[PDB]
Structure 1
Amino acid sequence: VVKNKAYFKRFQVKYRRRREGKTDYQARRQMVLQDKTKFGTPKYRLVVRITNRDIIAQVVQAKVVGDEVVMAAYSHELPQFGIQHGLTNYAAAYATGLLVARRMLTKLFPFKAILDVGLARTTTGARVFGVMKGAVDGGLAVPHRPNRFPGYDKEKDSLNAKAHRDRILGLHVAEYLELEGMYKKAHAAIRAD
């Protein structure tokens, strides 16, 4: 028996939120880390999550009490802006993040949150990078390189923005399925915010 009484003595429970499986902490401890020389001036973090039904973009900064969630842009609120369908697709992530990026500047050299992928694999064109590219294009100075935008070829080190633009506009789902105009119309309608 591996899990006898001696086992639960010497056993050290991992952190609740790792034990819960909900967070990487080598990343949390680096995402959060900033130069001590900075006496503690804010370091915002664009945490972004793809709950299987709906996207969640959330500008955030760490605190000892528990990190403040300064602003957030759930995909649920997309339909409020005319996106009635595909509220978890890459075409939507761009507008979710572009939304938080625009709802965050609405309070406010560019604002500089950094992306917090959490556990999502950073394969090219992953939806998480659509939240960035949306939010990054929406105002926030999220540091990044085009390497994981869709339409960025590994071989040939260059993005295909004429292709990256497509999936942003929902042409992505066109061929799997007139929408392209409801996103450009979607975007003016979130800047109307």
Structure 2
Amino acid sequence: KVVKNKAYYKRFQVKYRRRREGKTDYHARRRMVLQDKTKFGTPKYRLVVRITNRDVIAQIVHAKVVGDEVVMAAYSHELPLFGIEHGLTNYAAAYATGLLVARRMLAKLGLAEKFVGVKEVDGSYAAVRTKDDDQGDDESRFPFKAILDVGLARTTTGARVFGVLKGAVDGGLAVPHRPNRFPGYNKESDALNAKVHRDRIFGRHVADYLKQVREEASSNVSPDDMEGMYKRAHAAIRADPTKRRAK
């Protein structure tokens, strides 16, 4: 018996193009672009984070009927312009690219002088001040806002997508979030370990693995300074976010 006969093709209804290609989850997309009708089409921004086999992409997008409009994208392959030329896909790299896009967005908006964000890097939740979450005062200027979008990625504790989120938050952007997914979080005591989070941010785990690899290489470039240029790269990014590779 043949099921794919002529009548089968007549009645077939094709799915959406980006659903056939397995790129867009429209069930989550509809809830993400939805906005209150009382606000008559006031802009709403998304923070799109995508990770390939060799690069990390962070974009700020505003949705329109004619097609989505992208403002101030950033890619992890521009890091060698600042002093990071290895890995480019680990947790440390994800933090750096999130910081770079936040500074670029703020500079373009002309608000980088204010909203400088935190400078000392540590794993601490703090909180995000939005219009619906005054966090006390409500008269000071409100920070620029965006909502995180992860697509089809699996959300687990210690995922690199949340590393991009932490970098953007520390850059000065206001993105609503909770510490439940940061690598140092323990769910049984519902607590977060600052030391664990900051270690992964500066790539402590990578150095230990690289060191151990060298030892096992014996009897079958150098660690202990990763925090060195990672801090130096942060200062360079906070100094000149707009510099790029021209050709």
Fold-level match, TM-score > 0.5?
Answer: yes
* Deviation per residue, 1:74-111 (Å, 9 max, x gap): 00111111011111111101011111111111112111
Higher strand share: 1
Which one is further off, 170-179 or 112-121?
A: 170-179
Counterpart CA distance in 1 for 2:177 and 2:41 is 23
Residue 25 (structure 1) aligns with = 26
* Deviation per residue, 1:26-83 (Å, 9 max, x gap): 1111111111111111110000000111100111111111111111110011111101
Residue 108 (structure 2) aligns with = 107
Q: How many residues align?
A: 193
Counterpart CA distance in 2 for 1:71 and 1:4 is 50
TM-score, length basis structure 1: 0.96
Q: Is 1:143 matched up with 2:176?
A: yes
Amino acid at match of 1:64: V
Larger radius of gyration: 2
Shift of 1:7: 2.1
Counterpart CA distance in 2 for 1:41 and 1:9 is 43
Identity across matched positions, percent: 89
| Structure 2, gaps ≥5 residues long | 110-141, 211-224, 242-247
* Deviation per residue, 1:119-178 (Å, 9 max, x gap): 111111111001111111111101100111111111111211211111111113111111
Counterpart CA distance in 2 for 1:181 and 1:174 is 12
Residue 94 (structure 2) aligns with = 93
- Counterpart of 2:234 (choices 169, 187, 193) is 187
| Structure 1, gaps ≥5 residues long | none
Do the aligned residues in 2 keep the contact of 1:91 with 1:172 (CA within 8 Å)? no
TM-score, length basis structure 2: 0.76
Amino acid at match of 2:70: V
Do the aligned residues in 2 keep the contact of 1:129 with 1:149 (CA within 8 Å)? yes
Which one is further off, 42-51 or 31-40?
A: 31-40
CA RMSD in angstroms, aligned pairs only: 1.1
Larger RCO of the pair (alpha carbons < 8 Å, separation 6+): 2
Counterpart CA distance in 2 for 1:60 and 1:36 is 20
